[model samples]
Target: MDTTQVTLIHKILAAADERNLPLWIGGGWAIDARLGRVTRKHDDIDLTFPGERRGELEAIVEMLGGRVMEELDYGFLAEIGDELLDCEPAWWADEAYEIAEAPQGSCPEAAEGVIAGRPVRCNSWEAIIWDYFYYADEVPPVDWPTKHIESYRLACTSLGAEKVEVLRAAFRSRYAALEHHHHHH
Candidate 1:
């Protein structure tokens, strides 16, 4: 990550942390957070907040000179400066770790770590696997070796193959489509 990107992340995290707003790092950034280092350059940061209090995040983003750039069924993207914060509004479901239509269940506890010398919250290994499989179509093929492969092993170890397969099947078609191009890459 560049200095400007790191600065933006720090500013955002500080602002939200000051207000005690909970957030989870997701997408590629989440993998970096899990590994406690930046594996490669990222176009933007991804985050998730409690579904009920998404307003707080929206307000914070706006307060930080961010504008809503895109909206999805699950959440919105806030463009602040040159950085894009992909945000998800998630709610905890009845399952021990599951959330309502979430890509995957939350880890028993947040995966805590430091990135760019700042503390951050990230999804657990299992959740990361769920995310990759859930958004398989969107994830880049290059990240498979640099990030997902080890994460997949961890996810299977921690959550079991059966559970991982459930996630895999959810986005089966996406992976299948990518499979054809996998050899060329």
Candidate 2:
């Protein structure tokens, strides 16, 4: 990644840490953080904060000269100059730390990762797999970009390949059952 974003990451983390707010790195960068190195250049950074601390998260963004670019159902997009920060909130207030009931495409409590030799919090491998499954169910995997496919694979293998396959199978059956209820309507 470029120095700009990498530096921004440190700065953002510094602000969040200074305020004692935890930020979970998600999406592509999360995977890299887990590996403790940058695998590919990222276009945007995905950061997640506790839902209860939404205001605080925004404060850090604004404090960095960034403003909320777009607020949407998934989360809010913030812009500090040119780089985009795709921010989401962990449903900590709704007991979302429970893996079974975590929000469809968001994160859970942090898992330890690293960035440039600095310790960082990141989305759990299990959570990343869950999100990928949700995304695949929403949009067929055949249409997924090569970068995402590679990212998914890397995130999975980090844990164990066999378990991930069966893990996906489990969500496949479970997600399908829920889909039938909607189709019946």
Candidate 3:
């Protein structure tokens, strides 16, 4: 993990916590958070906030000297120097599924955690694992030589075998349904 990225994450989490803004760390950083340290070099940081607070989030990004480059259908990307902060404006549904374009006033419960010893909020390991498996074929491993497999081991160990199996079941069921839907269409 680059020391710069570690410091950057600390600053970002500090700012969000200070502002009392709801944010969830996702992507490669999420695993790092679960592991309690930076395990690999991250190209960008991925995060999310409530969908209704786009302007609030934008202000925070600007306060950090970053500018929102484009409004994605689900969220937006703020360019900060050489780093891209991918922000998803999202809400959790009844099934704990995150909907990027949630309606106003939706608030989802977040898992409280620490990254590099700094307090932060993030998605449940269950939710993150679902994505990990579902997108396994599409997303490139962060560190092909080691971190990829290491992340899986760390995540499962951190979350435990029971929880991992439960999450794996959820992923299989969800992926199967989606596959059937696509094939039929």
Q: Highest TM-score: which candidate?
A: 2
Error in Å for residue 181 of model 2: 3.1
Give the winner by lDDT: 1 or 3: 3
lDDT of 3 at 137: 44
TM-score of 3: 0.73
What digit string (tens of lDDT, one per residue) describes model 3 on residues 82-184?
Answer: 7778886666455443634222222235555667676677766665555566556466566344655666677778779997787677666766887899999
lDDT, model 2, position 22: 78
RMSD of each: 6.9, 2.9, 4.5
Q: On a 0 to 100 scale, what is the lDDT of residue 182 in model 1?
A: 96
TM-score of each: 0.70, 0.85, 0.73
Off by over 4 Å in 3: 92-111, 137-146
Rank all candidate structures by their TM-score, best first, as comma-separated numbers. 2, 3, 1
Q: What lDDT tens digits, residue by residue, belong to model 2 across residues 27-76?
A: 87888898888878777888877666778888898889989888887788
Q: Whole-model lDDT for model 3 versus the true structure?
A: 0.68
Better of 1 and 2 by lDDT: 2
Find the number of clashing residue pairs for candidate 1.
0
Write out the backbone clash pairs for model 3. none
